[PDB]
Amino acid sequence: GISHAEGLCDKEFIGKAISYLYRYGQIYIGKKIEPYGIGSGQFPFLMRLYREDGINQESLSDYLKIDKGTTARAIQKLVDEGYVFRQRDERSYRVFLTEKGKKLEPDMKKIASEWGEILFSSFDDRQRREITNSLEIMFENGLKIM
């Protein structure tokens, strides 16, 4: 309290805060997506396909930095739920949204919003903006040395 006003900081706090927000996020998102029969482990893949559809399953793995075996199980449940399909292309597989998956998008993006909204409570626009900006740089700082 005097330590923080004096400038000193828990150099562990950044990583701790992030791990917790992530886990809280997975719980909050998790409950909201259950009704679509989707686990919070599948959400990140679905959200990626909405940006870049028809991506190779290995690419999905490397970008999200989720392992091949976790990736395989996630994509498999997404297929069994009928939200995506796989296509072998002239070995490995490319994954695509089905119509069912495409029509889900407004719901997914809205769920992600309600979560951000919960996180930003008490922040105004300038403040939301520069924290999102700082989170972008923090990530590129990791990404450099990854």
Place this chain on the structure above:
Amino acid sequence: LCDKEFIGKAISYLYRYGQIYIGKKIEPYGIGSGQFPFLMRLYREDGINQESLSDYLKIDKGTTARAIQKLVDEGYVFRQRRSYRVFLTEKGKKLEPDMKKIASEWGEILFSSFDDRQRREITNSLEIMFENGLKIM
């Protein structure tokens, strides 16, 4: 891409990048990145009921059981009696300075390009966000 939507994604990517990073730094101790958070909480509070670890970290029971079981196999924790309290072994206790250095090294990397004032605003903001999300649990 909306700010509200993207803050989730940014946090998720930082998390996963953190685990891969921590994961590599702690590999010489035979520790997985999944057990790391349990070890850290024990540094704050030794001899806690296992479900209390689970509740606090908000990692579910199976994930917790497997992680604890590995830390026991690895010799870093033991259990005493279901209701088990988990304690650090001496070998677990010795690792603490290294674990804290490694976590703080990840922090430094994330903040590497910021001036002092950006670091303070960021931290302050994270605390607020942290509490906002804690209330919703």
